[PDB]
Amino acid sequence: SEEETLVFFDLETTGLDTSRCDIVQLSAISGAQVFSVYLLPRCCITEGASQVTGLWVDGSTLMLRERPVQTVPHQQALTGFIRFLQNQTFGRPILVGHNSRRFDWPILRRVLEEFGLLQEFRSCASECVDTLSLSREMFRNALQKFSQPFLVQHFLQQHDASEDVRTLQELYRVWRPSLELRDNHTFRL
């Protein structure tokens, strides 16, 4: 199929510096198809990042609160996401991410480049929709806050990237953004 598929994606990271932080969780959903992997970071997870996500490192073991989680090496994790975009969405994907222009895409772009995978990635998706700036337009003089947890509480009445891509996809469905609005918040990868 040559029809468009939306791929909602999200990261959990070691901190807030987009030029430095590593990825600890990489997740995506497209319709019913789900991709989600944990990665063992190559740098320290900040105390603040651990407070928000529950993720911390015990030696070589990534932990989510009291429980170890299984990690995938960076090379394989990133290749898996590329293969998902190439083979698993049953259409031609466009990415969608909250605060993706200023945060998630700069981070993912940098990490992809470290592993020599950026150009292959850009060959399976060309564009990304930023639902942060989109929601700010759609609710410009209406909402006071636009963080995804606030929006999920407000619109769905309910920080794990696998849960968060699912609720972002549901938010997007509730909002039903027009293509003219979406185009205002689409950028090229």
Cβ(48)–Cβ(134) under 8 Å? no
Cβ(49)–Cβ(105) under 8 Å? no
The structural domain count of the chain equals 1
Cβ(28)–Cβ(5) under 8 Å? no
The Cα-based distances of 111 to 144, 172, 175 in angstroms read 33, 27, 31
Query: What is the edge-to-edge ordering of all strands in the sheet holding 4-13?
Result: 33-38, 23-30, 4-13, 92-97, 127-130, 186-188
Give CA–CA dist 143/175, Å, rounded.
13
Q: Residue 157's domain spans which residues?
A: 4-188
CATH number for the domain harbouring residue 42: 3.30.420.10
Give CA–CA dist 129/188, Å, rounded.
9
User: Hey, which residues does 75 pair with through a beta bridge?
Assistant: none
User: Hey, which residues does 187 pair with through a beta bridge?
Assistant: 128
Using CB atoms within 10 Å of the CB of residue 102, give its burial: 0 to 12 exposed, 13 to 18 middle, 19+ buried: exposed
* Pair of tokens at residue 45: 């997870």
Give CA–CA dist 81/164, Å, rounded.
17
Strands 92-97 and 33-38: unpaired
Solved using: X-ray
Binding positions for Ca(2+) are 10
Binding positions are 10
Helix (H) or strand (E) holding 131: helix 131-138
Give CA–CA dist 164/11, Å, rounded.
9
Give CA–CA dist 24/29, Å, rounded.
17
